[PDB]
Amino acid sequence: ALYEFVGLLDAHGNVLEVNQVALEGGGITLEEIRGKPFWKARWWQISKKTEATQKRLVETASSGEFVRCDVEILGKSGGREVIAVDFSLLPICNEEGSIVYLLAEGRNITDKKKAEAMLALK
Amino acid sequence: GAMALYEFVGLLDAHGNVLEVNQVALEGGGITLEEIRGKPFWKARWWQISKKTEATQKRLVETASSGEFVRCDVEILGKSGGREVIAVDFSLLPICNEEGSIVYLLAEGRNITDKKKAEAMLALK
């Protein structure tokens, strides 16, 4: 559905723009994180594993690969509280096909109706 | 400095309705996001120098909405809270999702006013 959180990154994952709702959820101001890697921002700082995971998702998108996965973030009450989020990274190319930005999107799934994945039988 | 690499940017939906705009663009136009959110980009005050400028921006957004990349120079009410005209190198990038469907348009612009002034001076014969 239309995102709840959204951010624009350059192709190295550095933060360019972030909507107010995401900044309020993480307890972060844009000026504090702008120009620096997205994985360093507080949303991704539950642990060294969550940080590393997000750096890896940014590397995958920076390569042209679309990312979608459920993740946990410090994303509620000014960075105090963990929420689960459906998270996506869209590589944005220019007319020649070179990746120039990344779009980070998320929606809070903490109250979303419990859903079943499609699992292979084999 | 380090951040000079980017100036105005906005995120539109696939039909050009406004979703997000950065503060440099809003302050330069004297516009708040709430006056323009969910309504066509070409109705926002940057593009209202005349009916011509508005009609061209609507064409540019329809071009990008069809999946084509747009870049060209334009003039906007984009300095001193919308009070002054600046020339801008303006681009719209259609953004596709994983299935290849257009989901958003990225609007970017850089102020090239001093740049055109300099080109005109170097052009003097």
Residue numbers in the entry:
A (entry chain B): 42 to 163
B (entry chain A): 39 to 163
From the study:
There are two PAS1 molecules in each asymmetric unit, resulting in an antiparallel dimer structure. An additional α-helix (α4, residues 150–163) is located immediately outside the canonical PAS fold in molecule A. Remarkably, the corresponding region of α4 is completely disordered in molecule B. The TodS PAS1 domain constructed in this study did not include the corresponding helix region; thus, the antiparallel face-to-face dimerization observed in the TodS PAS1 structure may be an artificial consequence of the symmetry of crystal packing. During refinement of the apo-PAS1 structure, we noted a region of weak electron density in the hydrophobic ligand-binding pocket. The shape of the region is somewhat similar to those of benzene-derived compounds, including toluene and 1,2,4-TMB. Thus, we thought that the region of weak electron density observed in the apo-PAS1 structure may have originated from contaminants in the incubator (or the laboratory environment). It may also be possible that a cellular ligand, such as an aromatic compound, was co-purified with PAS1 protein. In the absence of a signal effector, the PAS1 sensor domain cannot provide a signal to HK1 via the flexible nature of the STR. This conformation cannot induce the functional dimeric conformation of HK1 to enable autophosphorylation.
TodS/TodT, a two-component signal transduction system, is responsible for regulation of tod operon expression in P. putida strains. TodS lacks a transmembrane region, and its N-terminal PAS domain (PAS1) binds a wide range of effectors, including toluene, to trigger increased basal autophosphorylation of TodS, leading to a phospho-signal relay to TodT and ultimately transcriptional stimulation of the tod operon genes by interacting with phosphorylated TodT in the PtodX promoter region (11–14). In the present study, we determined the crystal structures of the TodS PAS1 domain in complex with either toluene (an agonist) or 1,2,4-trimethylbenzene (1,2,4-TMB; an antagonist), as well that of apo-PAS1. The structure of each PAS1 domain is very similar to those described for other PAS domain structures, which consist of a five-stranded antiparallel β-sheet and three α-helices spanning residues 45–149.
